[PDB]
Amino acid sequence: MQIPGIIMPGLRRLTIRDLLAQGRTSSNALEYVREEVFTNNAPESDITFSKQTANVKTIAHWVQASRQVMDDAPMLQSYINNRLMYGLALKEEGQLLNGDGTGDNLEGLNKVATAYDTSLNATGDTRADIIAHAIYQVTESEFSASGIVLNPRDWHNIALLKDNEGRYIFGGPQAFTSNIMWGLPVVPTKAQAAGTFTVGGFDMASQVWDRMDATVEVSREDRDNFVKNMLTILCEERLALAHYRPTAIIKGTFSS
Amino acid sequence: IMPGLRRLTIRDLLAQGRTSSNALEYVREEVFTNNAPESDITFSKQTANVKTIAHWVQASRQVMDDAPMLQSYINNRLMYGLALKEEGQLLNGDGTGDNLEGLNKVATAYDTSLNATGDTRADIIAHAIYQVTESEFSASGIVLNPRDWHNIALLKDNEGRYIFGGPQAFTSNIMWGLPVVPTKAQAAGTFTVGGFDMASQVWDRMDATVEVSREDRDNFVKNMLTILCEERLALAHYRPTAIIKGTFSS
Amino acid sequence: PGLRRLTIRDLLAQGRTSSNALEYVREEVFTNNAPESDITFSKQTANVKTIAHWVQASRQVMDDAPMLQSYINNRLMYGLALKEEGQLLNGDGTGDNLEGLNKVATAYDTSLNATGDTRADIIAHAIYQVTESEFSASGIVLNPRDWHNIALLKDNEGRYIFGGPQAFTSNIMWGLPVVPTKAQAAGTFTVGGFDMASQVWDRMDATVEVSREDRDNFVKNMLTILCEERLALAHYRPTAIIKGTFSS
Amino acid sequence: IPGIIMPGLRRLTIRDLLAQGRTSSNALEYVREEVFTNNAPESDITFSKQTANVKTIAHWVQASRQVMDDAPMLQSYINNRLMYGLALKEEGQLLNGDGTGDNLEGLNKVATAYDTSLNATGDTRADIIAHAIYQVTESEFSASGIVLNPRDWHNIALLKDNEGRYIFGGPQAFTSNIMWGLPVVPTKAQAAGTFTVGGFDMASQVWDRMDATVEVSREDRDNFVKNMLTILCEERLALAHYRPTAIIKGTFSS
Amino acid sequence: QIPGIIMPGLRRLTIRDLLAQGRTSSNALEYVREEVFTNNAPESDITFSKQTANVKTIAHWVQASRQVMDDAPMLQSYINNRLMYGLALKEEGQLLNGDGTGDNLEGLNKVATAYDTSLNATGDTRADIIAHAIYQVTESEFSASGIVLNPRDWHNIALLKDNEGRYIFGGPQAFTSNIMWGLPVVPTKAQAAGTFTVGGFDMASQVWDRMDATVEVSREDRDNFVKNMLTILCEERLALAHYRPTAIIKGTFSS
Amino acid sequence: PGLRRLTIRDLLAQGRTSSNALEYVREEVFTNNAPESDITFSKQTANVKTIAHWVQASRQVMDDAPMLQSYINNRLMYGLALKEEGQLLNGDGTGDNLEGLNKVATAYDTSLNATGDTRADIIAHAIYQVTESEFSASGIVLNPRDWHNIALLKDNEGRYIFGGPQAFTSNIMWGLPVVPTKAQAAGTFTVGGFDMASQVWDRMDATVEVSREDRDNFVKNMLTILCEERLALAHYRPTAIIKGTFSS
Amino acid sequence: GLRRLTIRDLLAQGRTSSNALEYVREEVFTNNAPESDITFSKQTANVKTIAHWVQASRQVMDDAPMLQSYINNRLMYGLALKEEGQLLNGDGTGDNLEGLNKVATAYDTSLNATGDTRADIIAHAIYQVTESEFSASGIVLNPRDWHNIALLKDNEGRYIFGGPQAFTSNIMWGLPVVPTKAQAAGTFTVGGFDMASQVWDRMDATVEVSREDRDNFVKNMLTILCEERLALAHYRPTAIIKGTFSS
């Protein structure tokens, strides 16, 4: 195997990747701190510290194809793009969002994020109100919300909604296509579960580290993939995710 | 240009690409709807040819002069017949002769045991999305007949209430956050759902071109030259299980 | 021209030609036949009719003054489009007139009018009737009056069918641009894929001429001002254009 | 004979709504599209000859002799006071113009009245304006600009929709904060409770026969004794109304 | 030395901004303002009475640290907010109302025309009181410009309710906009409670400027100088004029 | 960099110096009755204290990759200023801390609340006592929680005091810069003419240092990262500031 | 010294240039006779740091001879006795390492003779080790659990294997003993440490000194430290057996 290394991916949608601070690294794992912020009553509302450490996992996306033709037609160039890179990038969120943080899985935000305090929403509160409450809870962490992670479906719903008046709230469909909400960007992705929403100040909350930029490789000899004249194409990336302040994030579920 | 694209065609729904061969081989991820364990996926050494689709609309024999005049007719009136027509082979095809292996050809039959008592003309679709996940994939979008879409959108209960129905919805051509593609190329009552995002891409060999024959078939008899816009494509299937076909119990 | 609406001319494809007459085939589709569902061509021909707008004033002062230019260029010029949309929108293709879209347009299935529909629900059904041509809806054409109602139209729900009246502004109705005008008679409406259902060819640019002996200008000491525009309409798949009126 | 300099109020005026023009004649004629609010048929447009004449608008005010043309205090006296009032006075003519004498044929006078028969029951000031923007189309012309009084505009600027929600938006230079995209011009000329709209863009046009010139006196009346020099600033122009039906005038009948 | 530009807070437009702007070059200036008679229907013509305006000098003083002055960066930021903002509060006291004696100016209230008390009613709302003012402004066929009154009074005027919590035309926001009846408002403290002023200050009279606000620093000089350890100052020369006092109304809220 | 929320430091006048301390005159304005309402003077002086933000972490990554900058760059500073407001908003004049506005602010006039005034009606009256200083209000400071409730508040008539939940975003209230910060204790508010009543001077831009040498950061693989900043807060006319609380 | 390199001289050593180790751990399968094959389980090992600190004064201090002798003669060795803790009884969280005892395997009582001594048990352990297909290398005991053993006497009033004369240093059954206090009395451990696991030294022993540390600068007094960064691994857990004298 060798590397027809190079071609990068591009989507018209803002990946969770962009939502988190960008910083490269040169290691297999690093150690940081966790501002264990106590939703402490009025006084010593001070934030404890926690000696935590994160490991650099690796994400990969593969797919088989024919040798001859592939290795002959520019189909490859484009093959990896809309297929591999598109998939890999898409799968990436799967970890940065609902990561499991086990074996090769990254510690997903949601899995770390703090639950939603349903204590705030009160009678007669449209889903819009719910989010209004959310934006707040994310403040008790001394951090302001940055953006919202919502599922396409439930985004469509929230996007276009009146108000017991012909008034349309937020402007959808006009501004409904991702774009923004209340002024905070929205990241609609398949990964995000239905009815389940997550909001926080990812701007200053958590950060991502890169150990090796995504790269593709192909092996004419994998799994008897030689006798069946069908080499395999793979694209992997090395990185680790560090969740500084958890409370800076909240995960909830609309009133289903 | 072809931007009477007041909708997004399947071509825009599927994943784009491009090749230099006249045909290409690929591994069909024969995904079994295996039970919890294995339940494992299999692979098949398949392939995809390259057909040449084109649209034609015979015109009068004089317009041949006014250049700027002829120009747009082509771009505008003409592509659409191209792409529209193109959208056909992509959707469903006999996969024989010059017909591409349309999605329907390979699409997986819609499970009937999933149909309740007992379920609205839309609930059926709802189930589809789920059956799609039965292949370890998500839902890219839905493809159904432009009429049926009307019934779904402009639909109320015993009372006058637009359930996820809203003339607005039709305008958006999207439901459950999934892109809807109203195309008359597919018979009514029929519908297709799956993760086309990566369920199957398309390869572009030769872009749209234009050829006219005064001499050719009907143009003599039509008595006017017949324009023609060629195009060369290659449809592939990486996981047919990520595609479901069926109809509404009527 | 003007600065406000959106001239039907924008909806219909554009272009130009040299000959004063054109030829083309008409996809006259056999729409609703649950048997061989196809289309039959109809070799047609386009006629380059010259349209112009009348406008009097007085020449002698004017042929000296600079501003009159800033007049027809900005003002009178508009008077052309308004009159232009007229012929296109509809007219007896008799004479120097063109085949108006309404003339060649198709009827409107009243069967779709289900109990419970509103004057706003009508146009909705129309949108569908368009798909019958294999094409899709691009824009809608109505008059200020009806549009007004439809726009600022509440319901027993105690709310607007679209948001606040603002709706009226920036004619967009469910992602489909609207165009209010006088050319469209009251109660009458039209929809379809104008973008690709018909193409307009521009022969020559609008030319202007002035005179006093014109009409009864020799009695009002006012010189006539006119601007002739040679244009010609063409219809490909008329079945795409839907014509109809409200029940009220 | 004065050195010269131009002027302009802070925000815009009606002088910006009407299509600009100019002429070298003391007058000129034109034609009027008597548009009948004719029922569905022969809704045709009758015609009228009609004639426009060049009028003169000037503002004057007096001040010291030896203290005047001896200090740059002059310009400031014109640029801020004379000009300021000139353009301000100008609006009145265009807007509320009497016609007779040096008076310009006011728009409001020629403008078509409002159709009260066109309001429904639970209507607010906002709704009315909407109805207005509509009646402007019956003239085959689209709305183009709004003209209300500050004491009234300020009102519409802040309204709740039966819910706290602000319409047109919060107060933001509310005037600049033009409504329905269409521009707004709140002046003292227009009366309180009274408004005028229409397609000023094409409804009428303006012609400038002479720019703003200034002259002194020192000789006038009985000012030679009290040494009260009289400063005057005039200008020559003509207002022409083409399709009066393209402009509506109404009032919020309280 | 020579400065560039003032720049006060700008959270409210001072009378200066309300009045007509102007600039003279003479240490004195004459003018004619017709004394408009509140003449009955006929010869309601306005008499032309000659007048004369004196160019007074106004000084604004701010204590300056000796150290602060030496560095350029430290001194300037305080100063720009510092000179213009201080001046507007300062200029009022002379512009709004002054004996127009010694170094004072012809205060608006000084030449202001007393309110017509014979316009009041059984009990017009404290707001209607002002309403009459605007009307009387017509006494001189002049369109009222803005209204200047005491900040406190403004409060009571804004926050008004009927037998219900019905924030009258007024309300919390309106107070923020400082504009009622579509007319500018200048809630300057220079005005005492019950003391108000209405009229078309836009053209009712213009103020001329002789010399921009300068700055002088001394250690020994002034009462503070004894305090030490350094001094700062703003000299400015302006001239308030009045062509038609009838265009200005004073009066007082009694009640 | 990009904080979103408008920091006090953006509500108070700004300027710089080269010294370690400043002198000025505190216009002790008496809330003096109608007559000698004149303002006394006090020879006050400001001290250029020093504040910073420290964090501990294993240099394992802090010195094995240039991404460390990247951390201190747009991530930490944000933490600095975030604590910067601490001192300003309220700080014990004792020690390195600065003259906290609250510590220098004037009490609130309870005489203004009246049965029937809503949380919002209070802060309203507060804006008044600001005029007492002969200056007007420029911005308010409340705890995020408070701002919340205050924002989307309603009454019988199903309406918001500001017409929409959105009010929250784009902090504004009657056109007055609102700054929601944890720095402000709940049930506590503070208003005034911060614009022209208190200035801040810069003595040294934000700086950072690194030294494992500190405390026991050596025996334990770690490192203390921190970035000091030199400032000085002045209070010319403190009366221009009010503070008080609510019910809870 | 112990001259038995504590716990370290018993495990395969090596070096590393990272902070994490992704090794393959052979989850062996005693199982039964047939598919006695050994599974595999991706495992990760973090790199933790540990050092030994000792206080000292400077006047009597910065003497090259003295200093450069105190350290590599005493200090360096003293650190070993400390790191031995983590290796032996290590935890998995914080700055702790995955100690063998934590991954060790429970001793089979089943082999205990009707009537035998503590020494006999160890033998069983050795055998139980070969079960993992791997031969045993060393033994771990607690001084005292080594005391009685060294004094196990036949009612025949005579030591067991032991004679003051007939004897050597730490060694039993042909394998080292490495007596250590870090090991809880009663609880022992045996296994083929040779291939059982191996440690990786990210960096050799480094010694640094500081004055501004705590209250030394005042109490003129100094602090010397010997930082050490390393991490161990674990292959066949069944190779390490931990037992607790039920007696």
UniProtKB/Swiss-Prot annotation, chains C, F:
Compartments in which it is found: Virion
Full-protein residues shown: 127 to 383 of 385
Linked residues for Isoaspartyl lysine isopeptide (Asn-Lys) (interchain with K-169): N221
Protein name: Major capsid protein
Signal peptide segment: none
Source organism: Enterobacteria phage HK97 (Bacteriophage HK97)
Variant or mutagenesis effect after changing N221D: Loss of cleavage and cross-linking
Phenotype when changing C227S: No loss in the ability to form cross-links
